[PDB]
Amino acid sequence: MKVKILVDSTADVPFSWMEKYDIDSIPLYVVWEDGRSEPDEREPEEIMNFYKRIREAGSVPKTSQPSVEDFKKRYLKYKEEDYDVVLVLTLSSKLSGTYNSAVLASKEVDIPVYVVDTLLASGAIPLPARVAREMLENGATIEEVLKKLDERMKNKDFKAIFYVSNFDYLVKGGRVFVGNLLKIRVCLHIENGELIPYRKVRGDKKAIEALIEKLREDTPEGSKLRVIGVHADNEAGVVELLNTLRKSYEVVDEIISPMGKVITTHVGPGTVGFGIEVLERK
């Protein structure tokens, strides 16, 4: 039994994991005020170009999910490449119709497609994808994978925690009060598939502390973690966050992933966060 794993571009999947865990990325779309559209392709150069253009732009674009057809075409491509099963992990059904499209597309094809509503977004989504791969590489059934993801998600073993410096992007995006102050950072997490601002602080150092204190609300210091650090063109930022994370957690694996066009569009450049997988709570 051979299984393809598909995430959407809002998963901000690390480049190397695509080949390494056989995970593909399906683009969502970015639509600028003038009617120009671009896809969110997981390619380092394209993501970099976009960073340059959005820092510069006169406007902030909007985003749309992939169509049912975009999903159908991928599913069928996997079929003709002799996969037996497609496993799809999408961002929260509460943030996007991506899950809806993916599910509708599954009804128009022969090949069994299992669609999982992760109730997450960005660097948290690949964490359950990796785990699905590892347990398929150890002989598990699809049924066994889906049951385990559900248990772990319901234990809140996958978390998404981040800060932005300019809240207006999220507000324009529609998925989330906070006003304006010099050096403000707004801290958010995802809880039950929704975006929740939980703290306003000033400057990176306090913001970093706030993210880690939120994690600490249900995961004691010294727990075993795996982590994807995410950033919208702010490498130094995510690097400090990860360093600070190590002072109080056993990080058994980490990698950095730049946030794609869609996530960036909503969070704004400068953003820093992490997707966290708890392996073992102390």
Ligand SMILES: CCCCCCCCCCCCCCCC(=O)O
């Ligand atoms: C892992 C930590 C970082 C988490 C960042 C999550 C930011 C989510 C922002 C909302 C994204 C909305 C995407 C909508 C896509 C669509 O148009 O259907």
